[PDB]
Amino acid sequence: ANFENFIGATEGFSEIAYQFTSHILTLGYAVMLAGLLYFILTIKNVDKKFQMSNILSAVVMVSAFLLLYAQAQNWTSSFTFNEEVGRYFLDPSGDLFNNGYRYLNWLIDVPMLLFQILFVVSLTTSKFSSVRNQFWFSGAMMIITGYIGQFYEVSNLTAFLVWGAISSAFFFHILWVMKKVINEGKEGISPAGQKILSNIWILFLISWTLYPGAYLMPYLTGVDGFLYSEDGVMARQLVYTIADVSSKVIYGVLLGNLAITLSKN
Numbered sequence: 001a002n003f004e005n006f007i008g009a010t011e012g013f014s015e016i017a018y019q020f021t022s023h024i025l026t027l028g029y030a031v032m033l034a035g036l037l038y039f040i041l042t043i044k045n046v047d048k049k050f051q052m053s054n055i056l057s058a059v060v061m062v063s064a065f066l067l068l069y070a071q072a073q074n075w076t077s078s079f080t081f082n083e084e085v086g087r088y089f090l091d092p093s094g095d096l097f098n099n100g101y102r103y104l105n106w107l108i109d110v111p112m113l114l115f116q117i118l119f120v121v122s123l124t125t126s127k128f129s130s131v132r133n134q135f136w137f138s139g140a141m142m143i144i145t146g147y148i149g150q151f152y153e154v155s156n157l158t159a160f161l162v163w164g165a166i167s168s169a170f171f172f173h174i175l176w177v178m179k180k181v182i183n184e185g186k187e188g189i190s191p192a193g194q195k196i197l198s199n200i201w202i203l204f205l206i207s208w209t210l211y212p213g214a215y216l217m218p219y220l221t222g223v224d225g226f227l228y229s230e231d232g233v234m235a236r237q238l239v240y241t242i243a244d245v246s247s248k249v250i251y252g253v254l255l256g257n258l259a260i261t262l263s264k265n
């Protein structure tokens with residue numbers, strides 16, 4: 001199956017790699033619940049014309065909280081401690097670790113995170129329906145092809161990389177459309193709004209790039225380097241969680257600050 005189950009079935013997990021990963025995943029869904037409350041409570045602070053962005057942030061928070069909670073429980077209950085060896089190992093009587101929860105979260109959140117900026121900025125020469133359709137098509141294809149490659153993570157590293165490269169083609173199309181959206185959205189808004197939009201672009205670029213980084217993380221030190229271990233598992237889940245908080249919660253806070261800035265007129 002996946003690299004997490006491979007490690008848990010051969011070398012097992014140290015108590016520190018197991019507990020750290022449980023804690024980081026728990027932090028992940030706890031932040032989404034706090035974000036859910038934040039976006040509900042602050043919807044009164046933006047003009048009606050921008051509130052669809054707060055609404056979409058709140059729906060993403062629900063998606064992420066429920067599915068990261070499921071992923072968290074799946075991590076903790078998939079490995080049991082062997083007192084003889086002193087490590088956690090894959091439990092044959094459990095469900096085994098499954099990354100489907102996170103991939104389903106991506107299929108849901110990606111179309112909504114890309115959609116919601118179109119309710120705060122105005123396009124100029126681009127058409128709303130054209131940008132929306134390009135975001136939704138390439139976002140869904142990016143996740144589908146990525147999910148396929150994920151099946152070959154352990155069994156066929158070459159198919160793993162080929163599918164992930166196909167997925168990356170769709171990712172670069174998204175980055176290209178988003179850059180055009182940001183550029184058109186900067187036209188004829190205030191300098192303070194243009195500065196926030198520049199920050200949104202940098203946040204978007206870095207936080208979304210973290211996801212392919214975490215996808216590749218165990219092979220980034222080679223076919224048997226330092227990361228091809230429980231340390232690549234800790235690092236992959238830490239980088240996912242950082243990307244999750246950044247791409248969903250911080251991105252949404254910044255769009256709300258932009259909406260407030262744009263009401264000053």
Ligand SMILES: *C/C=C(C)/C=C/C=C(C)/C=C/C1=C(C)CCCC1(C)C
Nearest residue numbers: 109146164167168171211212215247
């Ligand atoms: C909150 C969830 C978000 C923002 C998910 C974003 C996911 C991606 C940008 C995934 C990208 C991938 C690649 C570009 C190549 C390798 C496979 C993926 C699916 C991890």
